[PDB]
């Protein structure tokens, strides 16, 4: 399974999407990727977020796990960094899909939160009822702990 992951890492490193930077593996384990996601939403764009993509030994059939190393104040990201992306769900992950589509969906999730898919329900309630305070707290939290923009 590692060879497919290496091919995907190659086709991504040779042409990175604009919203990703510094994609690299551990050079003895291609099944784990490290990246610096570059958000574009007004609150999140002030900082860059470290990201880890873990590929299981059963990767072609089992979806990879996306996890934020840098803590992010988001409704759809758990407090340990787990991302509840629909494409990597066990329900509809299909072998024909690729990590490029996964990162496209992740970029759209970070740039367009959908509160109807809660992970941190209190953050979703804050977003829907007083979105101005959600924006204020999210900007404060991302500025407090965030990687410098490369």
């Amino acid at each position: 399974a590692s060879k497919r992951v290496a091919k995907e890492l190659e086709d991504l490193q040779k042409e990175l999407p604009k919203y990703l930077r510094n994609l690299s593996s551990e050079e003895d384990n291609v099944l784990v990727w490290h990246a610096l996601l570059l958000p574009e939403r007004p609150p999140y764009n002030l900082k860059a977020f470290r990201l880890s993509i873990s590929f299981p030994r059963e990767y072609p059939f089992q979806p990879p796990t996306v996890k934020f190393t840098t803590r992010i104040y988001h409704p759809n990201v758990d407090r340990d960094g787990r991302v509840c992306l629909p494409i990597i769900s066990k329900k509809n992950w299909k072998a024909s899909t690729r990590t490029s589509q996964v990162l496209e969906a992740l970029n759209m999730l970070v740039n367009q939160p959908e509160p109807g898919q809660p992970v941190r329900l209190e953050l979703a309630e804050q977003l829907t009822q007083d979105p101005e305070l959600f924006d204020q707290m999210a900007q404060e939290f991302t500025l407090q702990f965030g990687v410098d923009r490369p």
Partner: protein, 938 residues
Amino acid sequence: RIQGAKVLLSGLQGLGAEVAKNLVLMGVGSLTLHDPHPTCWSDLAAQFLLSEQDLGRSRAEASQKLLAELNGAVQVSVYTGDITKDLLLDFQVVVLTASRLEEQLRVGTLCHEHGVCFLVADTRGLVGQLFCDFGENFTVQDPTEAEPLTANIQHISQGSPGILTLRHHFHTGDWVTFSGIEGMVELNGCDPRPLHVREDGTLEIGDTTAFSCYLRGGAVTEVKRAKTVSHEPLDTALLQPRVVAQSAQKVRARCLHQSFRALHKFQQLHGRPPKPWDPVDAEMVVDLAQAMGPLKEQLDEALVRTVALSSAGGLSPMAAVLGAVAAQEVLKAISGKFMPLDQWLYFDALDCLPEDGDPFPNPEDCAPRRCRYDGQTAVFGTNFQEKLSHQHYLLVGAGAVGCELLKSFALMGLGAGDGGGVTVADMDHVELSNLSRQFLFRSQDIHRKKAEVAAEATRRLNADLQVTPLNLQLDPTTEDIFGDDFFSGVNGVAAALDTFEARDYVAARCTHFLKPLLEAGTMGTRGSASVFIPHVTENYKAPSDPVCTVRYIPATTEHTVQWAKGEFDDLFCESAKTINSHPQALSSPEDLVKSQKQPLLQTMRGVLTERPQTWQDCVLWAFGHWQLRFHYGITQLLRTYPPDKVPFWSGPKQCPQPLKFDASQDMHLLYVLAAANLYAQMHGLPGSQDQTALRGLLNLLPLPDPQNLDRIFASELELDSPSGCKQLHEDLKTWSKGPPLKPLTFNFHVDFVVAAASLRAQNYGIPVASHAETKRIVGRIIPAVVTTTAAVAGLVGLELYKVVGGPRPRHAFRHSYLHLAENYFSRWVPKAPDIQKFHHLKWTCWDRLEVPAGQPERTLESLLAHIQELQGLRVTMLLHGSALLYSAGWSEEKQTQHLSRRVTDLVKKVPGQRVLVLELGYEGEEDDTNFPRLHYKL
């Protein structure tokens, strides 16, 4: 229910031993053995209960003790007299093995006349005959293996035949009952009603004009109706055999039936069985078979002759398979469950014989020699036994199938001689739940290693073979022991694993080492046995929920069970370790902010701020957490997502409702009891089971309202800020003293999760899991049956016969799938490995490329050039498992740096490794193409 049925068992050959073992292990409370015939050497090759010491002694009398030791709760007895009517009437099921045809007819006529269930089981070499006779009218109550499929109602329509809306499958004419119905309180436990199916997915339940309006909830479960089964007596079934088989195998089974009838005629006319592989006796059997005429189509005389020649033996795998089937039929008769065999079952295993062009064993080659294996050499010969004694086999998994395989190996004599042996590898210990599902364990074996106990028991079955126990599993972490030097002596692998992942790993290792892998698997009454032979058959192909939905909207029973299990894990196992690991979070909020552990600590602190002092004080915490989880949280969810949210609670999703506490109810009381007992056992406080005193305390000091918890419980918006962690540390300043909390690894373990699952299921309207279902889901215990275990082990042994028999064509080997609950048994020839084609390359799942490193190790460029000229394709990618040694997509400098290096300078040198498995990708490769691995040899 099975304890009330008494079983008579005549014939104590290896087949009778298998039947008796299965019946005793399952726990049929009473069994009587009958075999006055003295023990002979022809029985020691299949009878695990008997040894060479009891020669001359009756088989039943000597085997009674060994049967009793298997299950002390079973009354194993011996009857030394004749099988008369008076003896017969004392039993509900009577099994005949090793019985002559006249005796079979005499017993069967009486059994049919007097309502006694009658079974005949016999094995003649590689052929097995089973006959059932369960009476003119036998009621089968549960003709389905699985539990009835419960479902839940969304709406109910009254008046003319009512329309049912549901949140499952149904059939016209099915009878269903209703439970947990609100509004229609009279429908709870009512008599079953007929059902009809419409094209739009709704169901009709007939007249419901007088019933009230639907309120909420409601569950519907179909009732498995009973069926009548009629069986003809053996006196007539011999002339019209209703053998269960596919349309292709009806004629072959019919010819085996006629062959058995001819063998019985031979026994009547000559007074002895045919001499092993005697052409004269085989020809006489054939003449008798052709004299009977067609059954009420031409007879296969070659099949009859082969059966006659091979019939002179008794084989351990055949005994295991046929006795497993017969024991399952006995249990069907005793308990009324499942569908019995129609009339007959014939099992053909003649594939184990040598090929047509190969020399068949001589008449004097199979003559008895006063040895354990006289029942085996009577069909396979003596040189086959000598080659069997030289086999060194890795058995992976010492479980139930592994123990039955060990029994089979000891009876076969596999590893008896020099150079041969068995290695049994298992890490797990003998739990009490492992007893009574397998015969290899007793009380003195509890919590000792499975491999060691199995080795000792197999040595007791046969002292000849060297069974070596290794207490290590077989996974990537144990490569140092199960390396190349280990597999150099190993001739094959027998797999009785508990998981698909271990099967996948052992199959990969078997493919790597070119070792024949026999694989055995079970679930319920379903079993499979597969054989994967290198360069002949295919490889083993293994099969493959997030907190995102489980935390706020559980749609299924598995979701609620997982939520309850995680709640138990973080309330009783994880957060205690978090407290005990580092006291820094309990002394400095600055590090507490960084540690990110506030919510678990806050919910462990509970509604209380002080440490609980007594049981009557600690009991408040349980129902405080009950109010927090089941009332406050769902209130927050409802206020965040209103019922008319833009509605959101539509389709599969429905609006939930908060739970109101009531001590008089069973579920709330059980939840409080289990939670309080678990907390007390963690904290060191004394647990208690006084439900009356606990409910008195509950109704004496209840909380005034559940909304005030805002003053004690901080929101997720606030616990991540200093304002929350500061007051959390202020509250917890007293919790850092005293002994640490004891984690409770999953006593009230089951009760807590059962109560939580029931509450959640009634909250969200999903079906409520039973105690057994909850235990199965949360403990991952496998539904297993001893009969399927024995049958699958016998099939694996049958394939082992062909594996040891040297080179064989693909048509010789068989894969087998059996489902006893519905009389399904299929043996099919496995397909050849699929030819993968890529331009001029053709390869299968076994192929590889072997390249030497050389006395001076070649550079990576040398290897790539060699592979390019060998295959005709340029290597664009090269990895070692997961480390990328080379890729053509790289920049020039990195490519040249890696090409100049040696392979062993790019990968870690595993100690003792001689073969490196490297993964290759070539130019123009289609996606996911698995090219042959390079076995780079040092």
